[PDB]
Chains A and B, each alone.
Chain A
Amino acid sequence: ASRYLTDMTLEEMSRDWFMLMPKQKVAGSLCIRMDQAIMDKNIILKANFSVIFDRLETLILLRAFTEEGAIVGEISPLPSLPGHTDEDVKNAVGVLIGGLERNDNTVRVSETLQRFAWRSSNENGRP
């Protein structure tokens, strides 16, 4: 019990990224951002978060990467607001996956995310 898992490196957490068609939604104090101009590619959801009692406790950062490594989505707690809950993170992932799949994107979650707060069930990818 009580751990801290990191799918991303310091570069991946701090890398600058740009959205052509920015879309921002809010789930609690978590900010969900994604580029609506992304379509027909395989996207992986990588996240850094702490666990406790084998449940996801607190999310540090979540970002969506394409196969080539570009950042196209993000979930992060808002800096000016207090924290979030286990349920808030799952709702945020559902919003990001649902919004990313509306543009025919094949979104997948990492192995650690699949263990504590996953979604989707996934669709087919295009070559």
Chain B
Amino acid sequence: GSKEDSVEAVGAQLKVYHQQYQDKSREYDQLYEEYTRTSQELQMKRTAIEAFNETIKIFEEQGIAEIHESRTKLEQQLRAQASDNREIDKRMNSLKPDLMQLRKIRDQYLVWLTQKGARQKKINEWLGI
């Protein structure tokens, strides 16, 4: 209980850094999976708005009226979804430095323990295998 105490305490820090990296990694994948979900729906809402107002221009030269409100509702939901989709892009943009720095310092703690005598079985226990 002296120099090994420092090894055990640092090895405990390796656990916390590993959890935090995996906890923010799990958070980052939820944001990306939901981000591509909304942008695909933004696409569909977009060309649906096209075919909406294109059913107007294609038959306004001849002259079917209450359809304008459906297009106004879609354009309302479009920029409301694009707003929330922008917030998702902002949330996970501030995570990349967190993920990179957590991963780098996790590796540096792993290497520090290796140089101090911690074998591979000790490293896996702190890493949850």
Structural contact, B110 and A14, CB atoms closer than 8 A:
yes
- Residue B123 at the A interface, CB < 8 A? yes
Known: A14-B120, A14-B123, A76-B115. A4 touches B104 (CB 8 A): yes
Known: A14-B123, A16-B119, A76-B115. A60 touches B108 (CB 8 A): yes
Shortest distance from the beta carbon of B60 to any chain A beta carbon, whole Å: 53
Structural contact, A76 and B103, CB atoms closer than 8 A:
no
Bound CA–CA A79/B114 (angstroms): 9
Which residues of chain A are near B111, meaning CB under 8 Å? 13, 60-61, 76-77
Bound CA–CA A121/B60 (angstroms): 73
Shortest distance from the beta carbon of A6 to any chain B beta carbon, whole Å: 7
Range of interface residues on A (Cβ < 8 Å): 10 to 19
Most A Cβ at <10 Å: residue of B107, B114, B115: B107
Shortest distance from the beta carbon of A80 to any chain B beta carbon, whole Å: 9
Chain A, Cβ-Cβ closest to B106? A10
Range of interface residues on B (Cβ < 8 Å): 10 to 19
Which residues of chain A are near B127, meaning CB under 8 Å? 10, 14
Which residues of chain B are near A126, meaning CB under 8 Å? none
Bound CA–CA A60/B104 (angstroms): 8
Shortest distance from the beta carbon of A32 to any chain B beta carbon, whole Å: 13
- Residue A91 at the B interface, CB < 8 A? no
Which residues of chain B are near A31, meaning CB under 8 Å? 115
- Residue A70 at the B interface, CB < 8 A? no
The 0/1 profile, CB within 8 Å of A marked 1, for residues 108-127 of chain B is 10111011100110011001
Which residues of chain B are near A78, meaning CB under 8 Å? 115
Shortest distance from the beta carbon of A19 to any chain B beta carbon, whole Å: 14
Q: List 18 A-B contacts (CB under 8 A).
A: A2-B100, A4-B100, A4-B103, A4-B104, A6-B107, A10-B123, A13-B110, A13-B114, A14-B114, A31-B115, A50-B104, A60-B104, A60-B107, A60-B108, A60-B111, A76-B115, A77-B111, A79-B112
Q: A3-B100, A76-B114, A76-B115 are in contact. List 15 more A-B contacts (CB 8 A).
A: A2-B100, A4-B103, A6-B103, A14-B110, A14-B124, A14-B127, A16-B119, A60-B104, A60-B107, A60-B111, A61-B111, A77-B111, A78-B115, A79-B115, A79-B116
